[PDB]
């Protein structure tokens, strides 16, 4: 019957909202990582080069 149909009618749109929330919750996890990984590695590239050149320079000073 139709009564319980309204109970149906309520659930289906909620199934979709769990998903929409979820979708955003996977993506964000993904995106938090994207910037973070990229941003440290830059710094560690940077740092390693300087920690080299200045030595070689100081070596040139020898």
């Amino acid at each position: 019957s139709k009564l319980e149909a309204i109970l149906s009618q309520e659930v289906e749109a909620e199934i979709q909202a769990l998903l929409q929330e979820a979708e955003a919750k996977a993506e964000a996890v993904k995106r938090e990582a994207e910037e973070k990984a990229k941003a440290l590695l830059q710094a560690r590239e940077r740092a390693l080069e300087a920690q080299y050149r200045a030595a070689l320079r100081r070596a040139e000073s020898a």
């Binding site: 440290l40 560690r44 390693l48 080299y52 030595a55 020898a62």
Partner: protein, 60 residues
């Protein structure tokens, strides 16, 4: 993997650094031996004169 990739950098960073700085020494030292010689060589010729001169002050 941002740590890993950077780990891979580090190797090279120590190695290349080593190899070059160590190499720089070769170039300097082996040139130092040479350049030391070349101030000796400048003197060699006009050296005699120095002795002659120095001898002259001391002699009377």
């Amino acid at each position: 993997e941002a740590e890993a990739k950077a780990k891979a950098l580090e190797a090279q960073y120590r190695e290349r650094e080593r190899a070059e700085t160590e190499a720089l020494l070769a170039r300097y030292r082996e040139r130092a031996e040479a350049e030391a010689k070349a101030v000796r060589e400048k003197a060699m010729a006009r050296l005699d004169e120095a002795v002659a001169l120095v001898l002259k002050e001391v002699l009377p």
